[PDB]
Amino acid sequence: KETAAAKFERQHMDSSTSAASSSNYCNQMMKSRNLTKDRCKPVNTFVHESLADVQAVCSQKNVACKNGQTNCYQSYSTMSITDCRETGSSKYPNCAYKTTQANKHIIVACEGNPYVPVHFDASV
Numbered sequence: 001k002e003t004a005a006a007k008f009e010r011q012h013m014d015s016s017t018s019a020a021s022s023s024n025y026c027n028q029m030m031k032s033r034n035l036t037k038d039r040c041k042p043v044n045t046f047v048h049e050s051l052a053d054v055q056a057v058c059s060q061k062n063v064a065c066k067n068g069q070t071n072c073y074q075s076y077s078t079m080s081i082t083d084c085r086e087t088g089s090s091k092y093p094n095c096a097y098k099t100t101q102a103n104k105h106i107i108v109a110c111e112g113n114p115y116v117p118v119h120f121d122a123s124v
C-alpha cells in the first residue's frame with residue numbers, strides 16, 4: 001500500500017529547477033500524478049527541490065497547521081514551487097488548471113518515524 005509519505009512525494013515532489021513541460025504544466029502534472037482520477041484535486045503545489053531539502057523542513061520552523069494540529073513546519077529558505085488551481089470551467093472528469101509559478105516558503109505537516117512530510121499545508 002502507498003504510505004502517507006509516498007503519497008506526499010507523488011502529489012508534491014517535482015525535483016528540478018522549476019516547472020518544465022511540453023504543454024500546460026498543471027494539466028499535464030495533475031493528470032500524470034493521478035490527481036484527476038477520482039476527482040479534480042482543486043488546488044495542488046509541486047515543489048522543485050531535492051527530496052532531502054523538502055524532508056529537512058520537518059526540523060525547520062514549527063507553526064500551527066490550518067486544521068489546528070501543531071505538526072506543521074515552514075521552510076527557512078524560499079523554495080521554487082508551482083501552484084495548480086482548478087479553473088472555473090473545470091468539471092470532472094475534464095479537469096483543467098491554471099499554472100502559477102512562485103518562489104515561496106512552504107509549510108508541510110510531518111508525521112511518522114522517520115518524521116517526514118505527509119501533507120502540504122500552505123505556501124507563504
Ligand SMILES: Nc1ncnc2c1ncn2[C@@H]1O[C@H](COP(=O)(O)OP(=O)(O)OP(=O)(O)OP(=O)(O)OP(=O)(O)OP(=O)(O)OP(=O)(O)O)[C@@H](O)[C@H]1O
Pocket residue numbers: 007011041042043044045065066067069071109110111118119120121
Ligand atoms: N498533520 C496534518 N495536518 C493537517 N491536515 C492533515 C495532516 N495529516 C493529514 N492531513 C490531512 O490533509 C487532508 C486534507 O484535509 P483538509 O485540508 O483539512 O480538508 P479539505 O476540505 O481542505 O480537503 P480538500 O479536498 O479541499 O483539499 P486536499 O486536496 O488537500 O485534500 P487531500 O488531497 O485529500 O489531502 P492530502 O492527501 O493530505 O493532500 P495535500 O497534501 O493537502 O495536498 C485530510 O486528510 C487531513 O487529514
